[PDB]
């Protein structure tokens, strides 16, 4: 689990808890995974709001592309055209998310150009 | 040329309009700080030595001490492009400033034989030579500030100790 230089390690194995109703799996408390930006050990802290939806693609690593269809009460043509949204998300050592898989994410500390959300739950 | 001359310790200074430029030609191609004799600028002031100290040329432009190039050049001074004549003196100076550091063979009824005094004596104590109630009040307010703050801090830290004992 070390394919890059420069002392791949936690930055002070290490373990913390964001709290607020989201579990930390036992390999993510005491396991060999580094958890650089996975918020359970991580360097990031949790805040903001939590969004939920199924996925479209998980092709690249550390990219979870959620879909999010939601109801909105349209008054214009008085029928509901169905919503769709997208958000990239970093991995977690709890679930290899495949197609389907309604999961939720919490807002924190922009990681790439467009990701502020990291997976905290699978159900 | 005109020669400004200054005898500094007596406090005297006067200009002298010296024509007849082969008298002047002793100063030529001698930059600022290098000394000179009275013998080749005059005969009536022999045994004289003048440290040159710059001079405005015609068109009024000054020379600053020690660069090069006795024509005019455009430098950056106190930062903007100001024109400044070179430190070396040539044929085209209007006035040239001189400090006489040894009187030679003739008295001068402008420089030597006439002098001005200084301005006024010193004002500072150490300059004349060469509070304690505030020292009471400073020390008293300092020890009172200590006996207030460093005791009050522990006086509410003990209230934290009471809250921790009751919790």
């Amino acid at each position: 689990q070390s394919e890059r230089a420069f002392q791949k390690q936690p930055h002070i194995r290490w373990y913390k808890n964001a709290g607020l109703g989201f579990k930390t799996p036992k390999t993510a408390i005491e396991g060999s995974y580094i958890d650089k930006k996975c918020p359970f050990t991580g360097l990031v802290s949790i805040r903001g709001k939590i969004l939920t939806g199924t996925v479209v693609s998980t092709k690249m690593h550390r990219t979870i592309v959620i879909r999010r269809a939601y109801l909105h009460y349209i008054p214009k043509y008085n029928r509901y055209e169905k919503r769709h949204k997208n958000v990239p998300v970093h991995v977690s050592p709890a679930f290899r998310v495949q197609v389907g898989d309604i999961v939720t994410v919490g807002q924190c500390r922009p990681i790439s150009k467009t990701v502020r959300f990291n997976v905290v739950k699978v159900s | 040329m005109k020669l400004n001359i200054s005898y500094p310790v007596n406090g005297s200074q006067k200009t002298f309009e010296i024509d007849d430029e082969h008298r002047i030609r002793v100063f030529f191609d001698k930059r600022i700080g290098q000394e000179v004799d009275g013998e080749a600028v005059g005969d009536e002031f022999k045994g004289y030595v003048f440290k040159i100290s710059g001079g405005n040329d015609k068109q009024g432009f000054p020379m600053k001490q020690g660069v090069l190039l006795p024509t005019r050049i455009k430098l950056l001074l106190t930062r903007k492009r100001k024109s400044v004549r070179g430190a070396i003196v040539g044929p085209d100076l209007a006035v040239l400033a001189l400090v006489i550091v040894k009187k030679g063979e003739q008295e001068l009824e402008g420089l030597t034989d006439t002098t001005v005094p200084k301005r006024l004596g010193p004002k500072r104590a150490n300059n004349i030579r060469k509070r304690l109630q505030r020292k009471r009040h400073q020390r008293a307010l300092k020890v009172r500030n200590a006996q207030a703050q460093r005791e009050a801090a522990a006086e509410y830290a003990q209230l934290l100790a009471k809250r921790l004992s009751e919790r």
């Binding site: 109703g21 709001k49 939590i50 | 509410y156 830290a157 209230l159 934290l160 809250r163 919790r167």
Partner: protein
């Protein structure tokens, strides 16, 4: 150019008084010029309200604070020396600043919502409020959104009101701004529309936020006196 909270008549002028910086925010306060001059009318213009501020009649939160645009926000007890004027100003039911008159034993204190508790430096517990009174050493059971009672002679917390299900809460913020009744429901969500819900005359229901609500007492016994109609 005015907000809604000041109860400011439109036939007044063109430039509206921006409050200066201070304890509260700009959006949740009224300055002393809009307090004294054109609300309870102890002045007629800015010159004479500056004159009485130089005379120093005002004693808001027990200190003088001679300033025209001093942002008196929620329940800062304005104290005026002549005719022993003690004024606690709260929110009414339609968004304005209802300035209730109180007495001396009630203006000897105020209360404040706690915002955060910190282990800041050198082992010192720590508490802030909406006027920012960084007072030393409360108990460990100060959660967010509880209510301290400030001493107003020194700064110490004297009493403490715990935020839980079944407490009398005041809502300052959003579309519920200035309501009282605090019990139909409790619902703590995980990031928004999370609150304790407030009744009405027919005990209707309401939604707000945690930070937009803060406790003032118990079900029938607040030690703040409240105005009536």
């Amino acid at each position: 150019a005015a907000p809604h909270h000041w109860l400011l008549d439109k036939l007044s002028g063109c430039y509206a008084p921006r409050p200066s910086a201070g304890p509260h925010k700009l959006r949740e306060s009224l300055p002393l010029i809009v307090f004294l001059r054109n609300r309870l009318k102890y002045a007629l213009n800015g010159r004479e309200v500056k004159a009485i501020l130089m005379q120093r009649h005002v004693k808001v939160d027990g200190k003088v604070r001679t300033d025209t645009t001093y942002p008196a926000g929620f329940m800062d007890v304005i104290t005026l020396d002549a005719t022993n004027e003690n004024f606690r100003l709260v929110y009414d039911v339609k968004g304005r600043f209802a300035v209730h008159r109180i007495t001396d034993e009630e203006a000897s204190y105020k209360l404040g919502k706690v915002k955060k508790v910190q282990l800041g430096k050198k082992g010192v517990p720590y508490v802030v409020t909406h006027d920012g009174r960084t007072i030393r050493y409360p108990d460990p059971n100060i959660k967010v959104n509880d209510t301290v009672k400030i001493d107003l002679a020194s700064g110490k917390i004297t009493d403490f009101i715990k935020f839980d299900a079944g407490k009398l809460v005041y809502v300052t913020g959003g579309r519920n701004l200035g309501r009282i009744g605090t019990i139909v429901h409790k619902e703590r969500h995980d990031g928004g529309f999370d609150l304790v819900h407030i009744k009405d005359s027919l005990d209707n229901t309401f939604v707000t936020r945690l930070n937009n609500v803060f406790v003032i007492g118990e079900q029938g016994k607040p030690y703040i006196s409240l105005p009536k109609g």
